[PDB]
């Protein structure tokens, strides 16, 4: 679609304005050093009786309490997880807000599904990088930096784009390239990615490989290899050729087998049931059983987490991963 | 069934108690100016920090708060919404109750679901019109009023059936006919006929008329016309002259048509499916979830409203509507 | 779509033209005397052993035969049951035919399917109002209309569509509103329209829901409340406000059981069967199954009529309506 | 699997220590009181305002206060149902908890859903008895006891399964015998058996039975006699002899019928269906809808609970209860 | 229904009549002392080449023959296994009967599919304690007794009811309550009772629930208490307090987990088997099976003996049974 670069892109915006990072996580850090390093004015809004609080401090930053930062800063960038923002908003963010202040996220789900409704007046955007904190930072620091989105929710004021794209220019996001999405295309597409292949499918595919083989009485060190431990292989060459370059980087027999076969594993119920997993997203029925997971404390996720550290591929990858001196 | 009218009522059991009403919504408002315009001795209970509170003192009505109300009167007349009744009660109107007093409601839903448990020595009674707010107004201003339905759920004083009745000839629903029923009929037939037909079913209906119709080339306008709009004609005929007075005041082709192809719209299987909403309304799982709905922050609902909000049938019904000057 | 009003039209074309309308019914009547009060010259034409015939003459009516009436005119409105148009017209109006005349109708169901061919050198026009007679006259009265649609089937004289349109500002029609569809387009969304939702389907509905409710020991009277006399009351929202406005004007509880309940009774398979019953109407095999019922003597016909009117929700809504005042 | 008597345990990791009971229910009070008994120091923790505070002074106990009972023991033993245990642990219990004491239950479902977690240092373990309350107190009062379990979940001290076996020796399980187990697995089997066998699967079966003999035209009185009351006969045998002993101690008849008829009423659908109940129970999900049960109102249990008094097996069984004398 | 206790019968019918009690099982050695006891003249027919015959005489009852008890007494009551009543009846009884005697069971399995035909002038009637024999004597040697049923089934002498209701005065179950009832609805019930729920039911529930557990890697010994062993608790709840009155002597999680998941156990396959196995025994084919069963060798009963013996729930059941001292 449409990107913002660095030539595309200045700090006009964010130029004489308070930055109030809230979170010190991988993306907490990451995009608070980079803002910092290209010249913002950056607080880091923590609570003090936490782990990050004395972190945040240790790199140099000005750290201050969530309601301490919310009223210093014109912007107000939040970063802790999903389940947790409406109730730190509406209690510590929300009284310090003003006319002219700025809303952003890097992960639209709250705005979206109503757990945190803005002020009038307050601009809402998003500042999100494609890229996990770690890599942000890395990059950042060597002159490039890592593909990021931008949306704008709400342009109160009028410069929310440029507020935006100025946070984007300071986190390094631009030099890689930058587009321009809604916060309901990031959150549906995030969530039904993570669910559908990111996370959910792709282990219940290396899950079924796996018993499949262990099952028929191959050895599961050797299972693990060839449903798991050689992915690695094909998704790092997918990501940086596409699907032609892999076909063309593996052997034939093993382009003949994965394009003959590979239908049979993605049948159509496979398919209808993705889009079942998009509506419930949609519509938000998926927010509501996570809303009530947490609310519920968290038995079932718990429970489940059990029984994924139970699995007969963790005990074998630990092994395997052990010898090879990965782990 | 059995009903009450004016000649069957009087208000010996209402006339020298006061009568709290809390909540000025369309039934609030209604009801309320009723009652005292019948010689009740009305007062009205509402939140300080509210917009009711100033128009409920606008028409000249004793505005007290919630507690204050509660405390004056000897029967609470509840009518704000059931999701937050339960809430409400317990904390501002049933630390005021004594023996003597009389709870009274519009809606069975929080009675029946054990949201609303009433101290020992209270009677529990329901005054429902059948009519909207605005109607049950402005029938009572004509001198005629609107059918209504009339409960007794505990009879601890001994006039429990007389105080509904009372209230029932104040707010003028015992001029058109009153019909004793129970609180559990009221609510699982009203939760029914909403889900099942008054509010879903014929949605859905006109959903897939309308999209049959556009999914095969026809006009949006002329397919809202026929699916949408023209449904008020069959209905106030229905609702004047019944099913067959509908039949003979419709062409004979419709007719005939109607006849012949309805029973292939409402197949078995949707036969079936209304038999499973009712035993959820029964059995309280639909109570649970709607409760859960709100306790998890009405993610759920908030995206289908905004689904429902981008249907074709919304855009052109309001160019329609617009054009015509309904909207 | 394009809309023609007031501003848009004239009567130009209909001028020094005399209009026969054919039919005293409850449209015949009201059109009529629209344009004959619109300043049109109209003569009804009508049975002189016939019912309407002296209702015609009460009015003020220039009252003649039906040939005579042909004869006379130069357009010829037609306003009798689509079941018998064929027959009357091919005795008795298409000798009294020349070159010049117009043939119009409010509904195209003859025309469409060949019943009615008309002779070269006449045009076929539509005007068809979107309201019953009653309300046709009645708008008019008031120096409103009500919203119509218009069509050309056959232009040989080159102002078919001047003549329709002139009708159009007679009738009233143009005051709200007057948009131009086509001959099959009005009658397939017609017949689809009250066979599958505005006649068959909501009938169909709603002696299913309650039905469901009787058949579960639901007393009979609260049955149809909620299933039936209730609904209009959703149905008028819905007609002035759409169904948004709708939902915003019903409690929160009837919303989310609406929304969440809807798609469980219209089914895949009442949607599949809404496909046929539109090729049905669009490969003209109703229409031969209409014409065959009234060959045959509409045994069939009158058989589901007793059915219908032996109904129980046909009884207790009759007492219901009795007590109301409302039958 | 391996058991624990008299011989096999001692009172030495108890002697000087003090134990406090929570909870004066049926295994509250028979559990204090033997342990009492037994030489063991024991206060007993409830609420001031409660019913069961009176009744735990008159049986002579130190009763205490919920924080001032988790104070002053070394080992704390909840017995409070599992719905509300977490929120009166994590307020009135783990403030006062330090390193070295331990914390005792009869049931795991806290600990194994991680409502409850222990501070770093504390012992978790179980003392279940698998008799009600009254069976306990009656055994140990005639110098035996009742079958019971143990279970060490964190040995932090060193002598967690002595505590354990200690208690069991006070309450006199160890006079029967005491097996070893996991919380997971007492949780997950208790769990499966009340839903599939116990309480649901029979209560079921026995509704089945009776309504076919009822629907069929027998004598409710009869059916009842056949399908519920006779019922407890086969079971004390099964109880006492095993299977084996109870169809050698019935009719052939009946045991030829039985043993031919049963694979009929507990299909292989009734088989995948006890396997997904157990997955349920297994993986939280089961947890989660009972924690929001409460949550929500108990609204879905207390319907339940209406419809299940409203059965008629309920009242013939009452009238028949009443004539033998039995209630 | 209607219940005669000792106020309402007499031993009239009885006094001056010599009862022969054919059987000393359970019920022929319970209702003969207790009829003996009672004053009733009592003579016992055995075989003498049996065991039985030995321990009748050391009661102190008159020993016969069955021929000489039958040529004897007036009424002979028949307590012997329903499989070969038939075959000791037409050759040992029949012969030795007169008009005016009466023909007694406990059981009318016989007398109802025809495997015995009275002659003309004999009665028949029924006598059936609803409580074992040992019970059965127990109670009446407390001055109470157990709840039975009366029947009568050929009147020719005209005091059968008379006739059955002394000797079930006799026998002690007057005292509890004797219900009227015919042979057709003790037999159908009871073979439904004993196939569907009582024996062949229970124990396919209890053995799909310990197979599920043990299955999925659970403790035998465990699974053993959870879907054997704690039933006979739930029973003897439902025994004395009904169902209402289990639930509310269990766990809530109990309740909650029984309501919701039992109706997935029993699921409508087994309602439907249910129905066709009351046809089968309405229809008599039961009876056909179960009597070929006996005429063939009992082949098939002895291995499923064989296999019931071989289970592992039994051998587990033995182990936990002897920790215990229950066997
Ligand atoms: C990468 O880590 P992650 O983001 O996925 O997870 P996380 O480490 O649990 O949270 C990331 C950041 O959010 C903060 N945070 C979490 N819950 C919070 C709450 N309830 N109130 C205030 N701050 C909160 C954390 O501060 P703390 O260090 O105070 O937890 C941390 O700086
Ligand atoms: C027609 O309107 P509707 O009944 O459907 O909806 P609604 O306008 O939202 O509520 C109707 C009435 O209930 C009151 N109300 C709503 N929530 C309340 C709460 N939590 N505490 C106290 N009063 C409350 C409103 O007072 P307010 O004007 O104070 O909201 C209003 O008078
Ligand atoms: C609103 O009424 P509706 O239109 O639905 O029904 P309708 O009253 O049966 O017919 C409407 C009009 O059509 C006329 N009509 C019906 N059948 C006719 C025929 N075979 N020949 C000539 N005129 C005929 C009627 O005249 P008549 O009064 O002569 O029937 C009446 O004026
Ligand atoms: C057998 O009875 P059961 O165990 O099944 O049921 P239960 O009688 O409702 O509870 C058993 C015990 O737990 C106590 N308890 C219940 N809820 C409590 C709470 N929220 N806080 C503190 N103590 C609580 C009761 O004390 P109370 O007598 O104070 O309720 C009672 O001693
Ligand atoms: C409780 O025991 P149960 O009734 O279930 O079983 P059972 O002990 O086998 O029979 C109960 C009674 O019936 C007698 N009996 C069984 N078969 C007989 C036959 N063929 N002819 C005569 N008497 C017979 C037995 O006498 P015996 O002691 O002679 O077998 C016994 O007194
Ligand atoms: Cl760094
Ligand atoms: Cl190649
Ligand atoms: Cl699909
Ligand atoms: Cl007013
Ligand atoms: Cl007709
Ligand atoms: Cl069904
Ligand atoms: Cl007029
Ligand atoms: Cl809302
Ligand atoms: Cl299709
Ligand atoms: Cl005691
Ligand atoms: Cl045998
Ligand atoms: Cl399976
Ligand atoms: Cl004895
Ligand atoms: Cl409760
Ligand atoms: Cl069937």
Redesign the interface.
Known sequence: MKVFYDSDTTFDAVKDKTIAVIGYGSQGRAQSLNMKDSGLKVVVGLRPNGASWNKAKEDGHEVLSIEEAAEKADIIHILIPDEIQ?DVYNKQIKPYLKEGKTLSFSHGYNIH???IVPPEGVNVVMVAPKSPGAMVRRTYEEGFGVPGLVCVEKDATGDALDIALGMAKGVGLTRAGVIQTTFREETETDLFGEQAVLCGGVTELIKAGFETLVEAGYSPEMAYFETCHELKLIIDLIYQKGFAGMWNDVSNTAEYGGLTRRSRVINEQSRQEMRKILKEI????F??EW???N??????????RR?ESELLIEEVGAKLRKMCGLQ
Request: aromatic share 8%; glycine share 16%.
């Open positions: 409406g599904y109503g757990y949609q519509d938000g029925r927010t509501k809303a009530l997971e609310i519920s404390g968290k038995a079932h996720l718990n429970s489940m029984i």
